[PDB]
């Protein structure tokens, strides 16, 4: 009942920037291997045991925000279902520890070898301590997203990363088929060690608030070109089928003539004297007509892209000539330019972009073909192992290779342009790579509510390290965390990505900044004005007004605020030290303005919008949703009916909805060994509890899921189905196979309501409401379901000490959607006799006021801790590897809510 307190250590994580994953047609190899060396580990630096875990994490939900979180805080690897870790004695996943047999098992001590083997083809992560096997493997886990190495630690550890090749030694023999993780580095980026998703980093003159980080995706490793098969070849193209081939038959050969690679009559191409500028008739016929139909293939790519040709001016054939240069002179059958010669011809930017994507569609077809012959990517080239450093999609390729591909086809399109045939750009379609996660885009920052100001004149600065979508201004204290600034009336903000002022809409004002600019923000609560000054110069509106906003009502008061888009870095300076301000003396000092934090000892507390979904109660004032509590009559059990308020009207919010009850049910610590009148001697001894939901008519059962969720569910998916449900299997055996334990871990246990309706011809709007029931046995951890009073083949078994919140995910399609019925079955107790200790012997259903429906709010406010851990990330040497060092201890006082298992 009462909220518990404790002192806990701050726990952080560190990763190499190595990202691997599995996808259909992915250019990445499905097995990888990395090692961790333990230098020094202080046993008990503070009152709590020192934390250290090593494992793999998933890029789309492993978000280790410092401070509070799941369970008793200090979350790291294995504390959720997006990570899997090992500590020397336990296999961590979903904030549960499971013991593992090991050859001389113990916690991670100094001079220990941790080798984590990852296989993605079959789901499996294997651990090896000191080169010796560890009898436990994670299995049957979801593959969406990218898997990366990670070590989570508390203060007072020194751990080294061994990545093989020049980035380690591995000190042992990796198992066959597992490549060193250092071979997965993308060609555009180098290897370095950086923390997981963050919101602050140290800077020269102060901490930098860091917006969301752009994350690479597995879908970005599949090369998806435009198909160049179903294209009938046009007459105007077959008319020019020859010259565009003749000009690309030795164009790659032209560069190296009169050098060490100068041709000779005895040999031919690929013999270190390649050119053979004579003609392609001397060259072999198959590659010859292959080059012709490759020129045709490039024209077919032009067609599929949307390029068409038209002839206007003088024929270039007349006004073109071949130049027998002093260079490229050869003795074999006369001398000529190796491709077909061309005079002065130019190219417009439309042609530049078009040849860029033309080279893209050449590269992605080549990469697709290589993958279809089995090849994959590796930063070091291995021909007998069939791996290449250039098997990545063009967007991920390096600039050197980009330019090298673009040069040849740029010459080709130039030769096409010379003949006067138009290169027609296609239509323009604006597209967004990622659309679903609109919330993982911004990250609002603001001062704590106690610093609310209602009088005087205040000033603060905001250096713009980057030049992207960042907004800075002032906000009222009740500012919502999930709504962009200015889009509502709760904030007055200036967007200097393109020079706009936002308050209930956008209108142009001032000018956009560049790097290094210090957007100083005034405020005048007496004159009711807000003034934005850039580099000491007042930003001026497109009229006579010099103040961005005027006649602003005092109200509750105002707080300095700023938000940052993806890949943005901004320095916020409230001015705790007055001399640190760079433009206060220039502007503001003589006007009577003051810094916002002129006389304060401690740094101003900052609250940011955490992008972690949490269950929160349904507001009574909510516009679209309402929850009605129905009294339990003599023949009807008490209910929690959900009804859509604005359904069927204009501006109705119809989207994915996640619900749960406010109180959980906990299974027994120890599992057991090995009419309609209830039996009095069974109803008192039963350990089975039932609840049902009545999905009203007009709500499609294809969009309804019913069951239970554990208190660590944090998935906000707009396209939810049973596929997205996180799961993992923990497999345990002895030293030589003999698997004697295979358990299931998941944060979601629900059935899909679309599978309990008979597939009728039409009329999915059933006149009879579907009554999905759920049953639990607290003595066994077994879960069952009843579709309409008949059992279903689905069944779930869970470990003890488990907490399950009754949950329903639904997409509304009617005025009345669902109705939580808190009834009972024959010889089976209701839920109300399970959630309350004092009600354990009462068969009569109840709906006490603590029991209520809660939604899943995607974004919630949070607090930035005043001090962060000090981690050193550096490369110790070529053999030692990368060394991570954290020594100074930090402790925070955690308030843990018992029934929600979060602190």
């Amino acid at each position: 009942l009462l909220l518990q307190t404790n002192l806990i250590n701050y726990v952080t994580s560190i990763r190499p920037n190595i990202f691997v994953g599995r996808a259909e047609g992915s250019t990445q190899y499905g097995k990888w291997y990395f090692e961790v060396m333990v230098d020094e580990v202080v046993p008990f630096l503070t009152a709590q045991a020192t934390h250290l875990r090593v494992g793999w994490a998933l890029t789309e939900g492993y978000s280790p925000y410092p401070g509070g979180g799941e369970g008793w805080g200090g979350n790291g690897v294995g504390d959720d279902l997006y990570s899997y870790g090992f500590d020397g004695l336990h296999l961590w996943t979903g904030h549960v520890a499971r013991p593992v047999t090991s050859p001389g098992q113990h916690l991670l001590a100094p001079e220990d070898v941790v080798s984590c083997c990852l296989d993605l083809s079959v789901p499996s992560i294997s651990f090896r301590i000191n080169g010796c096997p560890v009898q436990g493997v994670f299995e049957a886990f979801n593959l969406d997203g990218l898997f990366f190495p990670v070590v989570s630690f508390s203060a007072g550890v020194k751990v080294r990363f061994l990545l093989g090749g020049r980035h380690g030694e591995f000190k042992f023999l990796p198992p066959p088929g597992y490549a060193p993780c250092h071979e997965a580095v993308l060609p555009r980026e180098r290897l370095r060690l950086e923390p997981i998703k963050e919101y602050r980093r140290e800077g020269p003159r102060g901490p930098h608030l860091v917006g969301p980080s752009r994350c690479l995706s597995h879908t970005d490793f599949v090369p998806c070109p435009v198909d160049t098969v179903q294209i009938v070849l046009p007459p105007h193209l077959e008319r020019i089928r020859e010259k565009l081939a003749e000009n690309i038959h030795e164009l790659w050969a032209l560069t190296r003539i009169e050098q060490g690679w100068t041709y000779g009559p005895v040999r031919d191409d690929n013999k270190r004297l390649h050119p053979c500028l004579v003609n392609f008739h001397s060259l072999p016929e198959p590659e010859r007509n292959y080059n012709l139909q490759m020129s045709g293939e490039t024209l077919k790519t032009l067609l599929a892209l949307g390029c068409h040709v038209g002839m206007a001016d003088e024929k270039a054939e007349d006004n073109l000539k071949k130049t027998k240069l002093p260079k490229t002179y050869m003795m074999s059958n006369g001398y000529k330019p190796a491709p077909l010669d061309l005079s002065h011809v130019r190219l417009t930017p439309a042609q530049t972009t078009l040849v860029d994507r033309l080279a893209e569609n050449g590269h992605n077809v080549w990469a697709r073909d290589r993958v279809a012959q089995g090849w994959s990517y590796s930063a070091v080239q291995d021909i007998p192992a069939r791996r290449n450093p250039r098997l990545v999609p063009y967007r991920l390729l390096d600039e050197a290779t980009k330019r090298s591909n673009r040069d040849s086809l740029c010459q080709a399109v130039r030769t096409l342009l010379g003949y006067g045939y138009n290169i027609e750009p296609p239509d323009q379609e604006p597209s967004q790579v990622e659309n679903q996660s609109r919330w993982d885009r911004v990250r609002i920052f603001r001062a704590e509510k106690s610093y609310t100001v209602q009088s005087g004149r205040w000033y603060f600065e905001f250096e713009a390290v980057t030049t992207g979508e960042m907004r800075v201004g002032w906000a009222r204290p009740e500012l919502r965390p999930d709504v962009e600034l200015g889009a509502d009336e709760l904030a007055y903000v200036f967007n200097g990505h393109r020079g706009q002022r936002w308050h209930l809409g956008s209108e142009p004002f001032g000018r956009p900044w560049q790097s290094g600019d210090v957007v100083g923000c005034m405020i005048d609560l007496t004159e009711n004005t807000i003034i934005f000054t850039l580099n000491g110069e007042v930003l001026m509106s497109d009229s006579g007004s010099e103040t961005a906003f005027r006649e602003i009502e005092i109200g509750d008061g105002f707080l300095p605020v700023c938000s940052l888009g993806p890949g943005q870095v901004g320095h916020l300076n409230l001015g705790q030290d007055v001399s640190s301000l760079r433009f206060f003396a220039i502007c503001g000092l003589q006007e009577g303005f003051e810094p916002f934090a002129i006389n304060m000892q401690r740094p101003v507390t900052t609250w940011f919008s955490k992008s972690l979904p949490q269950f929160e109660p349904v507001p009574p004032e909510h516009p679209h949703y309402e929850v009605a509590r129905m009294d339990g009559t003599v023949d009807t059990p008490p209910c929690l009916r959900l009804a859509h308020r604005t359904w069927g009207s204009q501006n109705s919010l119809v989207e994915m909805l996640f619900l749960r009850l406010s109180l959980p049910v906990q299974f027994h610590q120890h599992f057991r060994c090995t009419d309609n009148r209830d039996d009095p001697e069974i109803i008192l001894n039963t350990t089975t509890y039932y609840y049902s939901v009545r999905v009203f008519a007009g709500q499609e059962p294809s969009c309804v899921w019913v069951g239970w969720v554990t208190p660590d569910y944090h998935q906000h998916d707009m396209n939810f189905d049973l596929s997205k449900v996180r799961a993992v299997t923990v497999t345990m055996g002895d030293e030589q196979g003999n698997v004697h334990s295979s358990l299931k871990c998941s944060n979601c246990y629900m059935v899909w309501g679309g599978d309990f309706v008979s597939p009728g011809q039409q009329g999915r709007i059933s006149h009879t409401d579907l009554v999905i029931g759920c049953l639990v046995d607290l003595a066994t951890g077994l879960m069952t379901f009843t579709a309409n009073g008949k059992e279903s083949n689905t069944f779930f078994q869970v470990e003890p000490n488990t907490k399950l919140f009754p949950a329903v995910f639904v997409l509304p399609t009617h005025q009345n959607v669902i109705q939580f019925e808190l009834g009972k079955q024959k010889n089976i107790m209701p839920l109300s006799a399970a959630m309350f200790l004092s009600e354990r012997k009462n068969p009569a259903p109840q709906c006490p006021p603590r029991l209520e429906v809660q939604m899943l709010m995607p974004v919630s406010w949070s607090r930035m801790p005043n001090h962060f851990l000090q981690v050193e990330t550096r490369r110790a040497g070529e053999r030692l590897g990368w060394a991570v060092q954290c020594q100074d201890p930090l402790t925070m006082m955690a308030l843990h809510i018992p029934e929600e298992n979060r602190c």
């Binding site: 001026m540 006579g544 007055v578 001399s579 003589q590 002129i598």
Partner: protein, 128 residues
């Protein structure tokens, strides 16, 4: 002092707008020339807000505010109210001579401590 004379001579004000209306002095370009160069109805005919005498006075005001010390703010208030009670420049000068000791004290307000710590850090400040 040019602004002082313009404020005193309301006759000079009358031909200020007369010159504006009869020469089509827009006054918007004279203040937005920097705005247009940096790539950023109601009172278009004439307005006090767009008067170039006050616009230049405002744009030069921070320099004039840089003259005095922060402890002189009481002296500014005393001189201001004596100006409001119809006194000439000599009168307020010798009034300040009678009230030379009425300056502010840094111990009495924490604001003045950081004000002096910033104001007297200027290289051009001479303590005598």
């Amino acid at each position: 002092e040019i602004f002082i004379y313009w404020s005193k001579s309301h006759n000079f004000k009358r031909e200020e707008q007369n010159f504006v209306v009869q020469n089509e002095i827009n006054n918007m370009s004279f203040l937005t020339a920097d705005s247009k160069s940096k790539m950023a109805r109601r009172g278009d005919r004439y307005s006090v807000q767009t008067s170039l005498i006050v616009a230049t006075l405002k744009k030069m005001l921070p320099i004039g505010l840089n003259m005095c010390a922060p402890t002189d703010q009481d002296l500014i208030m005393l001189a201001k109210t004596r100006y409001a009670l119809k006194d000439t420049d000599e009168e307020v000068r010798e009034f300040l001579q009678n009230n030379l000791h009425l300056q502010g004290k840094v111990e009495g307000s924490p604001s003045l401590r950081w004000q002096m710590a910033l104001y007297r850090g200027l290289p051009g400040r001479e303590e005598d």
